[PDB]
Curated annotation (Swiss-Prot), chain A:
It is found in: Cytoplasm; Nucleus. Component of the 19S proteasome regulatory particle complex. The 26S proteasome consists of a 20S core particle (CP) and two 19S regulatory subunits (RP). The regulatory particle is made of a lid composed of 9 subunits, a base containing 6 ATPases including PSMC4 and few additional components. Interacts with NR1I3. Interacts with PAAF1. Interacts with TRIM5. Interacts with ZFAND1. This is 26S proteasome regulatory subunit 6B. It comes from the Eukaryota. Component of the 26S proteasome, a multiprotein complex involved in the ATP-dependent degradation of ubiquitinated proteins. This complex plays a key role in the maintenance of protein homeostasis by removing misfolded or damaged proteins, which could impair cellular functions, and by removing proteins whose functions are no longer required. Therefore, the proteasome participates in numerous cellular processes, including cell cycle progression, apoptosis, or DNA damage repair. Belongs to the AAA ATPase family. The chain holds residues 280 to 349 of 418 of the full protein.
From Swiss-Prot, chain B:
Residues 1-47, 550-572 are annotated as: Disordered. The modification N6-acetyllysine is found at K478. One of its GO terms (biological process) is proteasome-mediated ubiquitin-dependent protein catabolic process. Residues 5-16 have a biased composition (Low complexity). Keywords: Acetylation, Phosphoprotein, Proteasome, Repeat. Found in skeletal muscle, liver, heart, brain, kidney, pancreas, lung and placenta. One of its GO terms (cellular component) is membrane. This is 26S proteasome non-ATPase regulatory subunit 2. PC repeats lie at residues 336-369, 370-406, 407-441, 444-478, 487-516, 645-657. It holds the Pfam family RPN1_C.
Curated annotation (Swiss-Prot), chain C:
Keywords: Acetylation, ATP-binding, Cytoplasm, Nucleotide-binding, Nucleus, Phosphoprotein, Proteasome. It comes from the Eukaryota. This is 26S proteasome regulatory subunit 8. The chain holds residues 59 to 158 of 406 of the full protein. The keyword Cytoplasm applies. Belongs to the AAA ATPase family. It is found in: Cytoplasm; Nucleus. The keyword Phosphoprotein applies. Component of the 26S proteasome, a multiprotein complex involved in the ATP-dependent degradation of ubiquitinated proteins. This complex plays a key role in the maintenance of protein homeostasis by removing misfolded or damaged proteins, which could impair cellular functions, and by removing proteins whose functions are no longer required. Therefore, the proteasome participates in numerous cellular processes, including cell cycle progression, apoptosis, or DNA damage repair. One of its GO terms (biological process) is regulation of transcription by RNA polymerase II. The modification Phosphoserine is found at S62.
UniProtKB/Swiss-Prot annotation, chain E:
It comes from the Eukaryota. Monoubiquitinated by RNF181. Belongs to the AAA ATPase family. Induction: Expression is not cell cycle-dependent and occurs throughout the cell cycle. This is 26S proteasome regulatory subunit 7. Component of the 26S proteasome, a multiprotein complex involved in the ATP-dependent degradation of ubiquitinated proteins. This complex plays a key role in the maintenance of protein homeostasis by removing misfolded or damaged proteins, which could impair cellular functions, and by removing proteins whose functions are no longer required. Therefore, the proteasome participates in numerous cellular processes, including cell cycle progression, apoptosis, or DNA damage repair. It is found in: Cytoplasm. The chain holds residues 50 to 97 of 433 of the full protein. Component of the 19S proteasome regulatory particle complex. The 26S proteasome consists of a 20S core particle (CP) and two 19S regulatory subunits (RP). The regulatory particle is made of a lid composed of 9 subunits, a base containing 6 ATPases including PSMC2 and few additional components. Interacts with NDC80/HEC; this interaction is detected only during M phase. Interacts and SQSTM1. Interacts with PAAF1. Directly interacts with TRIM5. (Microbial infection) Interacts with HIV-1 Tat.
Amino acid sequence: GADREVQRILLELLNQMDGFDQNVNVKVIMATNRADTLDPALLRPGRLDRKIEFPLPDRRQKRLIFSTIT
Amino acid sequence: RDKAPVQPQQSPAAAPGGTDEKPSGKERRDAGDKDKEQELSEEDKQLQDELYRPALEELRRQIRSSTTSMTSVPKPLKFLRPHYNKRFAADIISVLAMTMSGERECLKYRLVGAGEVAKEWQELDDAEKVQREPLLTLVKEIVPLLMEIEQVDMLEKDIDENAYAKVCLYLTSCVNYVPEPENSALLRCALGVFRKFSRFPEALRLALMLNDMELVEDIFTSCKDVVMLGRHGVFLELSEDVEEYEDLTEIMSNVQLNSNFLALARELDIMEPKVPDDIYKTHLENNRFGGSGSQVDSARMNLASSFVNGFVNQDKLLTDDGNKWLYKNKDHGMLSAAASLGMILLWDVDGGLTQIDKYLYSSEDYIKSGALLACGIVNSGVRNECDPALALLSDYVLHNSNTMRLGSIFGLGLAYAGSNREDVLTLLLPVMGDSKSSMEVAGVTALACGMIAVGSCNGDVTSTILQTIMEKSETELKDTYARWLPLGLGLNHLGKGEAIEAILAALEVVSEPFRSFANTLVDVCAYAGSGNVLKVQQLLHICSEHFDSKEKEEDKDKKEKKDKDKKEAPADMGAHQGVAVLGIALIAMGEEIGAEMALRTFGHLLRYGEPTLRRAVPLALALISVSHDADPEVSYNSIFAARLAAMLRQLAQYHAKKGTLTLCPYHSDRQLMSQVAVAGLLTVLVSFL
Amino acid sequence: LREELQLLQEQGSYVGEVVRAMDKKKVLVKVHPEGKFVVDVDKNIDINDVTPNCRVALRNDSYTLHKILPNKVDPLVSLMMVEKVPDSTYEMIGGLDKQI
Amino acid sequence: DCTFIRVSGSELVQKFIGEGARMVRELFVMAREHAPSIIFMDE
Amino acid sequence: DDIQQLLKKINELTGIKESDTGLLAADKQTLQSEQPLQVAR
Amino acid sequence: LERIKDYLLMEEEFIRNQEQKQEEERSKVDDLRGTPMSVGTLEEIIDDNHAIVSTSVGSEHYVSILSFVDKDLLEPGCSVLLNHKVHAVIGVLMDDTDPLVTVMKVEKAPQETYADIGGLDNQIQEIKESVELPLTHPEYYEEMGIKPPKGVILYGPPGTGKTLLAKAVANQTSATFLRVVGSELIQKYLGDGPKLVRELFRVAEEHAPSIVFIDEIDAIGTKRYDSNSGGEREIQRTMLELLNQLDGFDSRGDVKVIMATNRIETLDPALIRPGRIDRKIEFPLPDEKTKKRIFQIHTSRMTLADDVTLDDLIMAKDDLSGADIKAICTEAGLMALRERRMKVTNEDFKKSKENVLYKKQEGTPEGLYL
């Protein structure tokens, strides 16, 4: 029963995710760390085009982070 | 693809352009055209133009026959007089001349009523004897005898492709869908080509439908030419009706050529191999005498139990099971047990006199009358059991020899049936002239002269059954007379092909529904069945008549009518409400192999609460299967466990363990709601080997 | 018309769901949340229009049928909206026609 | 003009076929009732 | 085809005019005395 | 066409199928019934004319039956009709026909009867005296009093006609038929297979004598999936519920257990033992002679000239099946309609022959050890 309610909340999200307005710019920015336990029916064109990770920094980027924070 | 060089060739009216375009179009006529004839709307103007104008007819019938026309299509061929095994011949012969000549034969066979369609019809007959495909060209050339000269036209080499194919599909569709007057042409030219052919039981089925007496002489000089022998004696006797073994024994008593056809084809032969081999290859156990024979006594189910043990036939054990079983038995059960010894003994001519002789002329009227009844049961070729009852018959009201007239006049109806056997009928003139208050006197009068009178020459309205019409309408008393006299009336109407005797008795007889019930009885027994759906929708109309017994017989006609296309035989009669209608379908199952749809209808028809209709189910339920068999038996033990219910239980143990002889006696059993005197006439229903 | 607005002040009704009708002019209705109920028909409706999984207007007092309701479920349209496959035609897969 | 169907892997899709109860074969029901039916599947 | 199609048309024509031809107290008062009984949850 | 006769009989059967007070005490029982007839569920039956019922949410009552329908129709776990007033049991309700019955109980005798065979009539005799003779004529078992054989195993190459024989016995039937695919017994849950066995053969038991056929039953012992909770210690327990079900207790009944595999070696010999299945039946690829019979059946209703010999399709390939011959017929039809003809000529059987036999007639990637 609890899984069916999350199931129909995903149905509400998907059914109101494809066809918003195609002109009214609602910028939905979703965030996770996990990319595994996800429906690929979410990760679709029209729904979500760009797939943006935040990779770990390197030498010079952490130098600039240190120059900012310190 | 291109039509650029060849499309405007229709545009000049020049004759040489036509007379070299049309052989060119004949060369391209092997595929018809490049396409579906897009020249039509430009060459229909060329209809008015006329040297090789029959080749213009070939073009014109090619394009009109290419698209569509029902009468204008074969017109250039009947004007053409076809001139000038291929793909081209498969076009203009096998499909174009077949559909085209088919609509010409149909449209003119329904239109006019010439010889051009006879020439083209025999031309397509010859052309499909070249193509050699039957069973579509045949069924097309039925609707133009023409079919007779077709059969002697085509029947040269292919014996079975017109014998096993055409006579089975076309006899089956000829009793299924084609009406009567062409079935005679089937029978007679089938007598022609089957006379030219071997495997003589196809001609013997032509004797089952023709009922012809020249055929049996031809098939016996030919079936003595073909020397198994007694086996065609056996299905000769099972195949024949009541007339042609008396006509056969008189024309063979003249010639007979060996006299062994006089031995086979009257009696004694069709039964001499069976009963000793019935003892030999089969073995029955004593535990149905003891188990089904230990189904309990109430002197009614002891009566019916001795009837079940009467139909055990590892010998004639119940003939000589002691004494005091019949001493417990009452009068028409004394007919039942005095006739039970004959019902064990449908053989043993010499043994029948010496087993029945203890019960002949005894101290009891029903012992002696049921004993002469058993003498009528045992045989059909003795005529020496005629006189000890035939001399006694005359009583003039209500004496012993009127019951011996029941069992003996009925037993001589069992024993003999001539072409029209008449000395027994002149004895029957003081029987219907006697008119005892016992029903079964006039009962076995009509049934006896009716068993002589079946298979008659399209019936007759002669003074015999006419005498029982007028002497029937003499007294309107005991309406079982008004039911069982049109039994034998309709039995004399049997043998019909075209009888207007329903109109003759429909002018003489009809009145208040005793004699309108006679009208519906002749309506049943004169209309045995063909493709005649007009009286099937008339059947649907007078099915809703308020008199609910002309419903019973008139709707009871169904298992006689549609016994071959038996998919139509399940109807909504169980879904009707006039409970004798459920009786009617419950008759209409029958005695045959009994499919799962039939037994599925016996699921609901098995479960019903009236003792008469509940009594009506086990007769056909166990008769249609003459665990699997005993599972509905123990189910009836679960239904009841009155004496009617124990009696239907004994009836189901009994029945458990178009020949007219199996068509009469259940229709004689159709008034069951009555006395044990009528149950003394229950023990007459002989239809099994 | 304005005095005839107590009609609009009448008691409302229930939306039901007809599985199928059974014999003797009764039907089966599951409502918005509840169990199944063999309820009664009216005179001005049609038994010939008893459709499976059909919503009907159902009276709330006596549970009598009122009106048939359209626009039932659209299950294949709903799963079509779950999928959202790219609607394609002949003109967009140029470059090969043999497999076509 | 056939109903294009795509049944890949989801409990959503099983809920629209039946309720995800036992099997997929109510797709035979929605395919016979939409008998011009073209179905597509994934790896 | 003519035998099966014609016989099937014969059976259909038979059913057509047949369809056109178509047109307790065991415990009841005790149950009425059980209407003043109780639901007993 | 004859389409007028077909559509006319179709519309006539449709309208005739669409063609579907005086009794006062019956109206009195209808007055004993409420107009909102509610629906309940039985828990137990108490003999004092009233029992305990269960509501939809679970309000539970000691209510009485309208005593004209029988209380012997009532069993614990049957849906009833309840009142709203005293909530009395109104009457028997017809039971819920589940997707187990509406999918598995095949009402249709599907296809051709025993004229669909090739190389048979020994195995037809074995299924006849092993199933049909205990079904249709079990009177020899009265003549001697000897038990029938219980189970049947079909095994052989794929495409042999295990499907053909299963639909032939499914044609010649009078018992309620059930069909199960053996790959259906493993799900994404714990303790599902045994419940499927119990309700499966329960449904096979309740109605009538029945014919249970399960095909590809080896697909539970040699198949693994990530779509499976637990694993071999749930598959083994499903085999144990099928084990105690097939060799259970208390008069198993007239339920013919007929099962079909392709391979035979990976199966439980505790299920191969007699007592469970007494008729283990060899399915070989019969003979090269009844090839011509299967050509005669599969070409018996198609337009076709002579143009060939069947010996040309006999001295071509060693294994033989209705799957082989039928693919020759269908692929030959694809070549014929590809060449827009009727009366199929030889070259369609030639390219159909090479197309079918190459189609699977091969091996591994050439050379090997020829």
